[PDB]
Amino acid sequence: NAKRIEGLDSNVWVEFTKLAADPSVVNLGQGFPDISPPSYVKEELSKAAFIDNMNQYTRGFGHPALVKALSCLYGKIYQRQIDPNEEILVAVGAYGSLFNSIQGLVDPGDEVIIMVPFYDCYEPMVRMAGAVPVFIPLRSKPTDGMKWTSSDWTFDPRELESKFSSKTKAIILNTPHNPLGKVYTRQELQVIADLCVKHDTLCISDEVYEWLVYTGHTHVKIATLPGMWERTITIGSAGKTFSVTGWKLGWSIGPAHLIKHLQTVQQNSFYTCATPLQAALAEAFWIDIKRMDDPECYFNSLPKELEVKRDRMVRLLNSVGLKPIVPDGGYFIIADVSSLGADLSDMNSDEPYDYKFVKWMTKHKKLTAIPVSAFCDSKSKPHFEKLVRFCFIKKDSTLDAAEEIFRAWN
Amino acid sequence: NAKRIEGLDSNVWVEFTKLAADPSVVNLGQGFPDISPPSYVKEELSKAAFIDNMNQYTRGFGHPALVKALSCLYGKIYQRQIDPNEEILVAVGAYGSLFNSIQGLVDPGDEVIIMVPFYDCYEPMVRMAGAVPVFIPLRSKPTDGMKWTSSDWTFDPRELESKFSSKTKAIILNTPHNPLGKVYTRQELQVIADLCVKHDTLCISDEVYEWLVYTGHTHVKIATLPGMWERTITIGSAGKTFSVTGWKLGWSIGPAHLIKHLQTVQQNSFYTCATPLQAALAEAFWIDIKRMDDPECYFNSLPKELEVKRDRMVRLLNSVGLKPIVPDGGYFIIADVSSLGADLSDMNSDEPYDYKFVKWMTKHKKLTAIPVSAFCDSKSKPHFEKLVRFCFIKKDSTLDAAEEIFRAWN
């Protein structure tokens, strides 16, 4: 192995393969939608398949009709003109966008601030770049009494500030947050923005779940706050927006002077993304862009549908004594499992509690989930290891099977 | 920009975004097939599109049906049992496979040997890894007097040996060769094998054009030579194999102890490739794998169809005083351009001779092509700068438009 990848060969997802290959297990762990994607998304891909040209090379930095649809949709959200060619880069998922961003912008010995828990890829991407991840946790605060929510988690602005130094190149922001479901507030973003401007750092903002925010909350884009446009890369994903995780297309949106460096990594790595997927996606966008104010727009109908499933899930977790944290956004929910005081007596590894719990739940109850300590750096693990993450982008019948397990639990 | 991409922002193909544009020009430049993909390749993509699961995330290192198909096909070629999970990585094109190999295997300060002319991405990919490209040119031999062919180019084994030191990490091999169409001989591969074994170096073998070898030549895989399986990564491409360049799926095949490091790059960069493309590509493979014996197999029928088109191009180029180098393989043909009359003081730009010629032929003859100096490091360019490359993976009607241009040349 090359030095840049020393110790980066472990991967939580490669780790979690085994859990649910067993067909009789209900899998609420990985973010695999088993709802149907919209009919027209599948239709448009079939249509593109039969056009010879759409099966040949397209523009390296993104299919022209696609980046054009992206600049239209995001121009409305940002309330500014987005340049399709210079301010957008289409990459292989939000992963590939994150990869372009760190690879083109982050040097060895640079510091990168990461909020804990974090989508697991952030830490190894920062390391393969020779950079130093700097961790800060989200801490709970007292609850309103009736409900535990994502909004009861936040950061200490004084603690955040202390993480910023002359070596900080960037901070990574994930809102709506995976695994917590947190929708960052304008006040939180403002504290983040103040510091990035004051230290002259970048913000890389992972916003794949941007459409999935629930009543009481709103997606705010940090790159729309004063001084932030010039210093933010904001990332979206086809998989999340159209429920086609398997298309693996995302985009980075930001200023031309930053996006050019992302574009230089891409030209020198995989170069271009698939033409047929990008062609179909452009069409899907236009179909929904043109009804953005209608309920039937997929940007509106999916979170509306997911809010119902979310609520059903919180009731299911409650019925067995799991303390759910009701998410403001996204399609994951965390439950504290410690009030079950489960029977993990003879799992004798040095794994965190949540991993043992999940292995135990899979074997005994036939239900899998993801340990939140998978989204934590070594020192943070003991502070989050009683927490397990459940996925609810699932068809009713799947959540029915889940309900059968919760009803039979004792 | 990050330091790692310093000076790597210029891209040959980004630059040629000049006169491919104008409507009336016959483009024989970029490797863009304008023939149809096989009908079943297209139908299989349409069918995967309508299966919901084929739109969601698949195995990270390659869709299981696709790695199994590639296992079975390549295991016949190699006469060995290839492990589909450990000895194969599906990536985003041959580009992505090349990136995985260099990123996962090559350190700052390593030397990487590259044979000139080289497919252009080799050099910046080695520079991005902090390594030193060590150039050796292919050189001409006396012809049989009758015709000029790719096999009249070779390398000096003694000069190659002198490129190997204790800093050498690897040699990049490209057979059949782009741009010049060379199908490296068993005796050439043996000289490279002897030196990788003696120095304990890697060979990264880029064999995207492996099926496209014409009469009197045989694709031989260096990884099949004694002692080479354990030091070789061999790369393939869907875009070349099934004439669907826009699908951006390639693969690396080789021993587990090397493939795992490519796997580590990929899990940390883009992770997963697209599911519907991989599903459809697995089915396109099973179809052709079952009929390898038969002339109807795409592995057989395409090289046959293209050989006719190569022979046509060589007649058309001869017709106008461009001396073609007849390719053993691939879908590019170089023509020597020096026996024509120049223009070219209307430029004076002292950029290479071939770049001036290609601008002159675009403007005045309405035909584009690629200057060979684009595939050459700085010191080599004077040895190759009268050479121009043409693509013939084109429909009959495109080649007729080309015919009409040659007919009207004088």
Ligand SMILES: Cc1ncc(COP(=O)(O)O)c(CN)c1O
């Ligand atoms: C926060 C976050 N970022 C990025 C991704 C990956 O995005 P993509 O599938 O487009 O590569 C995910 C989905 N696993 C995610 O939850």
Ligand SMILES: Cc1ncc(COP(=O)(O)O)c(CN)c1O
């Ligand atoms: C020799 C060679 N290797 C790799 C590639 C790129 O392969 P892909 O399109 O699958 O990424 C090309 C482009 N045709 C090539 O000519």
Ligand SMILES: NC(=O)CC[C@H](N)C(=O)O
């Ligand atoms: N590698 C994957 O597909 C994992 C993604 C899934 N959304 C997760 O966060 O759990």
Ligand SMILES: NC(=O)CC[C@H](N)C(=O)O
């Ligand atoms: N998209 C591309 O860069 C096409 C490259 C093509 N194979 C060529 O060599 O001309």
